[PDB]
């Protein structure tokens, strides 16, 4: 309301803005610097956040379901609990951010950099991870049913065996150690 | 006919007997020494051959479909072309014998020693390879659809990638090299 008007003024820089539990549903924040804002349980569903700076902002349990995140910088952002269902994360920088039980069902993660992010028990069901850089990320406990990991970089990431029975892995790069894990995960013995 | 009567006399030893293209269908040859006989295109369908010695006998294009082979010694036997459909090979010694386009659809190979046998373009469709020792055997071109390779020893054997998409492999022992081959065979990249 206030800060909608701030955006319509050309003013692009809002850092550390305390935003806890707003409703911006389908609002347009494109290009703005939202670094470190306290967003806890905000409602941004289908907001337009492309190329915004969301780095190290506390998003825990907010709702970005549908929200538009292309090329946004989410580096080191607190996403714990958040519901991102059908949200659009193409080409975003998600490095080292924490998605713990973030809910990503049917999200578009194409060409997103996730290396070292923590996806612990996240919902990846039916999510597009295509060509995403997952190097060293920790997917333990994550829900992989129907996720598309095609052409993604898994080298170094720690994944539970059921991931190897569930994700589509065509093209996925892996360590030899991980290939061995994949085979075991289908019941072969070494 | 003649040699049926020989069997009913207690006479157990027939080595190098030229048998080419007989009909023994459902005959009982149990325990007999049939080493080196020339069997080419004989008809033994559902013959009882348990614990017979068939080592280095020329069986090319014979019909043992259904024939009973438990614990028989088939070591180094010429099986090229042969039709063994529904034949019963449990616990037989098939070491180093050649099965090239032998037809094994729905055969029981359980606990059979196949190490170094040559299964080149053989029909393994729906065949039970359970706990079979396949160490170093060459399965190139073989038809693996529906084959059960559970708990079998694959170490050293050369198998084409589609084997890794088709056989049930639960329990199968494998080299690390082979595990890597399995993963690649599902499209992962190293």
Helix (H, G, I), strand (E, B) or coil at B123: strand
Cβ(A155)–Cβ(A137) below 8 Å: no
DSSP chain A: -HHHHHHHTT--B--S-B--S-B-TT-B-TT-B-TT-B-TT-B-TT-B-TT-B-TT-B-TT-B-TT-B-TT-B-TT-B-TT-B-TT-B-TT-B-TT-B-TT-B-TT-B-TT-B-TT-B-TT-B-TT-B-TT-B-TT-B-TT-B-TT-B-TT-B-TT-B--HHHHHHSB-TT-B--HHHHHHHHHHTT-B-
Compare all CA atoms of chain B with the CA of A187 and give the residue at the minimum distance.
Answer: B170
Query: A98: which strand partners?
Result: A78, A118
Query: B38: which strand partners?
Result: B18, B58
Element at B178 (helix H, strand E): helix B176-185
Method of determination used here = X-ray
Residues of B in contact with A173 (CB under 8 A): 188-190
Q: How far apart are CA A51 and CA A72, in angstroms?
A: 4
**Closest partner CB to B182 (pick from A169, A173, A183):** A183
Angstrom CA distances, A49 to A44, A77, A118, A127, stand at: 9, 14, 22, 19
Q: What's the token pair of residue A26?
A: 């389908």
Residues of B in contact with A169 (CB under 8 A): 186-188
Cβ separation B179–A174 shorter than 8 A: no
Cβ(A67)–Cβ(A86) below 8 Å: no
Residues of B in contact with A183 (CB under 8 A): 174, 179-180, 182-183
Residue with tokens 């729906």: B126
Cβ(A146)–Cβ(A164) below 8 Å: no
Query: A138: which strand partners?
Result: A118, A158
User: Cα B3 vs. chain centroid, distance in angstroms?
Assistant: 25
Cβ separation B189–A180 shorter than 8 A: no
Q: How far apart are CA B148 and CA B163, in angstroms?
A: 11
Residue with tokens 């995960």: A185
Q: What's the token pair of residue B165?
A: 């998409």
Provide the shortest C-alpha distance from residue B186 to chain A (in Å).
Answer: 7
Q: What angle do CA B137, B142, B148 make, to 5 degrees?
A: 80
Residues of B in contact with A172 (CB under 8 A): 187-189
DSSP B64-94: -TT-B-TT-B-TT-B-TT-B-TT-B-TT-B-
Q: What's the token pair of residue B31?
A: 């325990």
Q: How far apart are CA B176 and CA B180, in angstroms?
A: 6
Element at B5 (helix H, strand E): helix B2-8
**Closest partner CB to B186 (pick from A169, A173, A180):** A169
User: Cα A25 vs. chain centroid, distance in angstroms?
Assistant: 19
Q: How far apart are CA B116 and CA B36, in angstroms?
A: 20
Residues of B in contact with A180 (CB under 8 A): 176, 179-180, 183
Cβ(A186)–Cβ(B169) below 8 Å: yes
Compare all CA atoms of chain A with the CA of B153 and give the residue at the minimum distance.
Answer: A189
Provide the shortest C-alpha distance from residue B140 to chain A (in Å).
Answer: 20
CA atoms within 13 A on the CB side of B44: 31
Cβ separation A186–B169 shorter than 8 A: yes
Long-range CB pairs of A28-34 (<8 Å, 24+ gap) are A32/A7
Non-local CB neighbours of A108 within 8 Å, separated by 6+ positions: A87, A88, A89, A90, A127, A128
Cβ(A154)–Cβ(A136) below 8 Å: no
Resolution of the coordinates, Å? 3.0
**Closest partner CB to B188 (pick from A182, A189, A190):** A182
Non-local CB neighbours of A72 within 8 Å, separated by 6+ positions: A49, A50, A51, A52, A53, A54, A92, A93
Provide the shortest C-alpha distance from residue A151 to chain B (in Å).
Answer: 8
**Closest partner CB to A179 (pick from B171, B175, B179):** B179
Domains and CATH numbers, chain A: 1-190 (2.160.20.80)
Q: How far apart are CA A75 and CA A86, in angstroms?
A: 20
**Closest partner CB to A171 (pick from B171, B182, B189):** B189
Cβ separation A189–B171 shorter than 8 A: yes
């Amino acid at each position: 309301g206030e800060i909608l008007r701030h955006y319509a003024a050309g003013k692009r820089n809002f850092q550390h803005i305390n935003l806890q539990e707003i409703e911006l549903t389908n609002a347009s924040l494109t290009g703005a610097d939202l670094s470190y804002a306290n967003l806890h349980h905000a409602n941004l569903s289908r907001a337009n956040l492309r190329s915004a700076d969301l780095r190290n902002a506390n998003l825990s349990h907010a709702n970005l379901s549908g929200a538009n995140l292309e090329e946004a910088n989410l580096e080191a952002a607190n996403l714990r609990g958040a519901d991102l269902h059908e949200a659009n994360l193409s080409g975003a920088d998600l490095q080292e951010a924490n998605l713990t039980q973030a809910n990503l069902k049917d999200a578009n993660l194409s060409d997103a950099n996730l290396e070292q992010a923590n996806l612990n028990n996240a919902n990846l069901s039916e999510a597009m991870l295509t060509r995403a850089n997952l190097e060293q990320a920790d997917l333990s406990g994550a829900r992989t049913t129907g996720a598309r990991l095609d052409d993604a970089d898994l080298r170094g990431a720690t994944v539970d065996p059921v991931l190897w029975r569930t994700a589509s892995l065509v093209g996925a790069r892996v360590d030899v150690d991980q290939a061995v894990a994949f085979a075991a995960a289908h019941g072969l013995c070494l």
